[PDB]
Subunit: 78 residues, 4 copies
């Protein structure tokens, strides 16, 4: 397997990456955590970024997540 | 394995994602389904979007699919 | 596993996709084959496209391939 | 498995690709090595490139790496 998804880069340089530890990480370009988002399963899918900055990623809990840029859930799709 | 491919984002913000349930999903940015497209196998490949909006994704049924933005098959390649 | 890599789209709309059948495929947007390129192993890696149109993809024969837009080998890196 | 991640392309055409041999490779468009970066595990994740050229990739040593364009470590995140 792979511990990390491929990263995605936001407008301000934020680095978003999924982990098989079940979290989506948002990392500042300075290497400090901005936030992390808890899903119910491994995040192998590489995040995509919408035109408005929404971060989308699938989880092995079977949901497609839409996360606001501040780390709060926008919605999940099953 | 992974339940989801990595998502792709269309011009209008539509989120396209493959599933190992054999479907390609097109999701409105509001979290409601736009359409889903039935293939014959797991869609692990992450979709790509052409300049005219066509959505391309491979399936483990061994076909490369070209899907119109309205969810109708354009062609499949083997 | 997955039969297909994720596709990449060229300037003219050409769709490039790797297969576990060991080939990199270049498909016209009309669904007809432009060319295919034979490697020595499964092409699980998703191709990337350079600014000059070169197509790059890794193969499980352990080479990173650079392919010209006309399907001829440019170089391979090990 | 897959020996290579999907490649990423830098501003000057440099091709960045991870290997399950634990290294991230930066290859000149002419096919000669620019540098390689040693991690502690397979680099299955496909690199992403920041707006300032930083290369980000995850490794199965459980770190997300930020690498400067000259191949020197910028930081690693766990």
């Amino acid at each position: 397997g792979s511990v990390h998804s491929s990263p995605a880069i936001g407008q301000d340089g934020t680095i978003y990456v999924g982990s098989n530890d079940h979290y989506l990480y948002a990392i500042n370009p300075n290497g400090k955590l901005k936030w992390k988002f808890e899903t119910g399963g491994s995040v192998h899918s590489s995040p995509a970024i919408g035109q408005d900055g929404t971060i989308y990623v699938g989880s092995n809990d079977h949901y497609l997540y839409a996360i606001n840029p501040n780390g709060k859930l926008k919605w999940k799709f099953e």
